[PDB]
Ligand binder design. Structure first.
Ligand SMILES: CC[C@H](N)c1ccccc1O
Lengths: 237, 300
C-alpha cells in the first residue's frame, strides 16, 4: 500500500526499491505573445529516479524535442515518465530490478502500472510522504547537465557522494531530504549556507561539498534554522 | 402462451416472474403461471418469507421444453424441473387451468418493457455463462460469484461472464499504453467485439443479462459486470453508430425499470458520472441521461 511515516525504515532494507519523481519532467516558462496572449516555452526536464538505500540516481534527461507537436503535455509527461521508468527497469539485469517503485505523486500510478504490466511482481506504490525531490534542479551539477543536453540522455549519479562510507542510509536520506527541503524553501539562502566557506570545495566527482563530520552538523543545523525562519514568515508565527 | 405449473407452495414465498411478483401464503393452492409470452427468455424467482437471505431463480425459454416447479423440503428451495412426457404435462396444466389455480402473466398489451430488457438475451448464451449442461434452464442466486471475482471459490457454481480488466495486457497493446488506456476502442472493437463476442448483439445480451441478475437477485458481481460493459463502450472514442443508439435504448429501459429504492447499491456513481458527463460518449446517450437526471439527480 501507501508509504508513510509508519513504515519508513522499509526504505533502507535490502529489497531494491526506487522513488520516481516526475515534477521536473515537463518544464515551461510562461510569457506574453506579440498580440498580448500567453504562450509557454518548454525547457529541458528530467525524471528523478532514486534508490534511497544506495544513493544511485538515474537522471533521465527529457529534451524539449519530445513535446514537439504534442498536445495535452502535462498528461503526456506522466506517460513519458512511465515509459522511461519501464525502459530503465527492462535495461537492468534481473538481480538489479526493483521489487517496488514508489511514485511521489499519485497521478503517476495508473501510467506506471500500465507500462509495467510485463512486471506483475514489481509493486507500484504511492506515498503519503511530502518529499522535496522537486528541488533536484537546485543542485548545480544536475541543473547544468539537464540544461546543456541537446538530445535525450541518461546520467548516473550517487546523490549521497561518499557519505555512506561514514553514515547509514537512513541518516544519508535524512540529510538529503533536509538539504532539498532547504533549497526548496529558500534556494538563495540554502546555497549561501553550502558555499559560504571557500575553503570547503565540491569534488569534481561529487554533488555536495566535502564537509567533515563536525561541519555537517553545523550545516544541518543551519539548514533547519532556515526552514524554521521561512516557516515563521509564511504563517506569521 | 406457455405455462409453468407448480406442484404446490408449501412455504410462504414471494414469487417473481420477470418484472412481476406475487405473494403466496404457506400451503396456498398456487399451481403455477400461465399465458407466458413465447419468444423471450423468462426468469422465475423466489424470496422466502421466513429467510430473505438468498434470493434465487431460474432462467428458461418455454420453446426449449416443458418446465415446472416443485418444492424440495431437503435442500429448502423451489426447484425447476423438466417434464419429458408431453401428454402428462399438458394433462396437468389443463387440469390446473380448468380449476383456475394459476396466475396469469400480467402483461399489458401496450407494454414492451420485458422485450426491451431482454432484446439481445438468448438462452443459449445464458447457458454458457451459467454452466450446468444437464438442464435446459439456468439457476442463479444472490451469492454466486463471477469468474473475475474468483481470480481475485467453487468453479461449478460460478457466473462465467467475460472478464474485462482495463489494466491488463488483454486491454493494452505493447507500444500503445497511453493510447489504449485513454481510448479503449481497440479493446472494445478488436478484442471484445470482433474477437470474443463476435458481434454487438452478443455483447448487449451479456450486458442485459448481467443487469437483470443484479436487479432480480442483488448479485453484486453481475452489477460489476454490467457497469464494466457500459464503461468499456463509453470509454471508447470509436463506436459504431448503431451500437451507441442501441445502448441508449438499453440503458433507458434498465434505469426505468430499476426499483427507485435500490439505486444506492446497484448504481455506481463513478461509472455513471464518467459515462454521462466525462467520457467520449457523454453526448451519445440522450435518453439515458434524461431519465437519470429526472429520476436520480442525487447520484449525479
Ligand atoms: C442457503 C439455504 C438457506 N436455508 C436458504 C435461504 C433462503 C431460501 C432458501 C434456502 O434454502
Amino acid at each position: 500500500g501507501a508509504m508513510n511515516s509508519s513504515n519508513y525504515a522499509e526504505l533502507f532494507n535490502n529489497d531494491i526499491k526506487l522513488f520516481v519523481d516526475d515534477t521536473n519532467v515537463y518544464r515551461v516558462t510562461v510569457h506574453k505573445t506579440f498580440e498580448g496572449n500567453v504562450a509557454t516555452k518548454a525547457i529541458n526536464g528530467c525524471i528523478f529516479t532514486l534508490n534511497p538505500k544506495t544513493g544511485h540516481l538515474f537522471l533521465k534527461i527529457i529534451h524539449t524535442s519530445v513535446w514537439a507537436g504534442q498536445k495535452r503535455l502535462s498528461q503526456l509527461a506522466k506517460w513519458k515518465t512511465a515509459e522511461e521508468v519501464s525502459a530503465l527497469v527492462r535495461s537492468l539485469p534481473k538481480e538489479e530490478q526493483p521489487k517496488q517503485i514508489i511514485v511521489t505523486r499519485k497521478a503517476m500510478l495508473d501510467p506506471l502500472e500500465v507500462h509495467m504490466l510485463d512486471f506483475p511482481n514489481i509493486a507500484i506504490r504511492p506515498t503519503e510522504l511530502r518529499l522535496p525531490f522537486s528541488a533536484a534542479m537546485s543542485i548545480d551539477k544536475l541543473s547544468d547537465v539537464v540544461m546543456k543536453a541537446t538530445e535525450p540522455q541518461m546520467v548516473l549519479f550517487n546523490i549521497y557522494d561518499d557519505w555512506l562510507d561514514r553514515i547509514s542510509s537512513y541518516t544519508a536520506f535524512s540529510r538529503l531530504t533536509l538539504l532539498l527541503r532547504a533549497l526548496k524553501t529558500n534556494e538563495e539562502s540554502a546555497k549561501m549556507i553550502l558555499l559560504s566557506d571557500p575553503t570547503i570545495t565540491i569534488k569534481s566527482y561529487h554533488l555536495w561539498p566535502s564537509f567533515t563530520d563536525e561541519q555537517w552538523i553545523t550545516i544541518e543545523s543551519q539548514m533547519r534554522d532556515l526552514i524554521l525562519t521561512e516557516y515563521g514568515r509564511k504563517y506569521n508565527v | 402462451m406457455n405455462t409453468v405449473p407448480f406442484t404446490s407452495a408449501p412455504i410462504e414465498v414471494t414469487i417473481g416472474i420477470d418484472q412481476y411478483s406475487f405473494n403466496v401464503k404457506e400451503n396456498q393452492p398456487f399451481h403455477g403461471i400461465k399465458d407466458i409470452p413465447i419468444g423471450h427468455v423468462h426468469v422465475i424467482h423466489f424470496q422466502h418469507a421466513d429467510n430473505s437471505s438468498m434470493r434465487y431463480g431460474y432462467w428458461f425459454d418455454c420453446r426449449m421444453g416443458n418446465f415446472y416447479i416443485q418444492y424440495d423440503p431437503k435442500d429448502g428451495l423451489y426447484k425447476m424441473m423438466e417434464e419429458r412426457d408431453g401428454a402428462k404435462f399438458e394433462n396437468i396444466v389443463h387440469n390446473f387451468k380448468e380449476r383456475q389455480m394459476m396466475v396469469s402473466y400480467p402483461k399489458i398489451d401496450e407494454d414492451d418493457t420485458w422485450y426491451n430488457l431482454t432484446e439481445f438475451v438468448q438462452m443459449d448464451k445464458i447457458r454458457k455463462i451459467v454452466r450446468k449442461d444437464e438442464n435446459q434452464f439456468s439457476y442463479v442466486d444472490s451469492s454466486m460469484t463471477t469468474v473475475q471475482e474468483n481470480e481475485l471459490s467453487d468453479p461449478a457454481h460460478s457466473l462465467n461472464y467475460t472478464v474485462i480488466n482495463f489494466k491488463s495486457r488483454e486491454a493494452i497493446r505493447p507500444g500503445h499504453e497511453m493510447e489504449d488506456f485513454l481510448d479503449k476502442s481497440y479493446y472494445l472493437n478488436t478484442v471484445m467485439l470482433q474477437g470474443i463476442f463476435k458481434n454487438s448483439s452478443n455483447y448487449f445480451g451479456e450486458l442485459q443479462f448481467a443487469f437483470l441478475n443484479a436487479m432480480f437477485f442483488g448479485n453484486y458481481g453481475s452489477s460489476l459486470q454490467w457497469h464494466a460493459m457500459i464503461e468499456l463502450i463509453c470509454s471508447s472514442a470509436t463506436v459504431p453508430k448503431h451500437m451507441l443508439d442501441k445502448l441508449d435504448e438499453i440503458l433507458y429501459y434498465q434505469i426505468k425499470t430499476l426499483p427507485e429504492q435500490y439505486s444506492d447499491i446497484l448504481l455506481n456513481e463513478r461509472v455513471w458520472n464518467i459515462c454521462l458527463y466525462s467520457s467520449f460518449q457523454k453526448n451519445s446517450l440522450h435518453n439515458t441521461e434524461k431519465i437519470m437526471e429526472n429520476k436520480y439527480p442525487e447520484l449525479l
